[PDB]
Design a protein around this ligand. Structure first.
Ligand SMILES: Cc1cn([C@H]2C[C@H](OP(=O)(O)O)[C@@H](COP(=O)(O)O)O2)c(=O)[nH]c1=O
Ligand SMILES: [Ca+2]
Length: 130
């Protein structure tokens, strides 16, 4: 079982990263288990906007670390990010604005939940799957 922890938004960055204050320190977080198009790729601007809206509108941001590595080789926090209880990682995949990706053993608790969301976005031909 994983645990949600508090954080506050410092700044939206792009489709799958955001700047949050966590235990009182500014950090860039990179969303576990997903990949968004870069800004210049088809759907890249839409993904950034989607994440932005979701984190900016949240009254409460939380981060949830998985069982494995909590920071990547770039110093980015690796987490599932929640906005008012709704996982931002999942919500983007469900809308076809991210693909499930970067699934490493031991940081993959939510892998099946996210693949189910992606299956539904693909069935619906949403966005990336259009
Ligand atoms: C999501 C994720 C990315 N990464 C590293 C793998 C990729 O290395 P490389 O930079 O060498 O390609 C990079 C992709 O992140 P981005 O999609 O933000 O570019 O982030 C991790 O190590 N663990 C993770 O869980
Ligand atoms: Ca990316």
């Amino acid at each position: 079982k994983l645990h949600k922890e508090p954080a506050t938004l410092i700044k939206a960055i792009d489709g799958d990263t955001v700047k949050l204050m966590y235990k009182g320190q500014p950090m860039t977080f990179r969303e576990l288990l997903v990949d968004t198009p870069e800004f210049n790729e088809k759907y890249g601007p839409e993904a950034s906007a989607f994440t932005k809206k979701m984190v900016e509108n949240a009254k409460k941001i939380e981060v949830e670390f998985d069982k494995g590595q909590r920071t990547d080789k770039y110093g980015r926090g690796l987490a599932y990010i929640y906005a008012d209880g709704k996982m931002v990682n999942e919500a983007k995949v469900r809308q076809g604005l991210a693909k499930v990706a970067y699934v490493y053993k031991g940081n993959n608790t939510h892998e099946q939940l996210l693949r189910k969301a992606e299956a539904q976005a693909k069935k619906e031909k949403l966005n990336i799957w259009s």
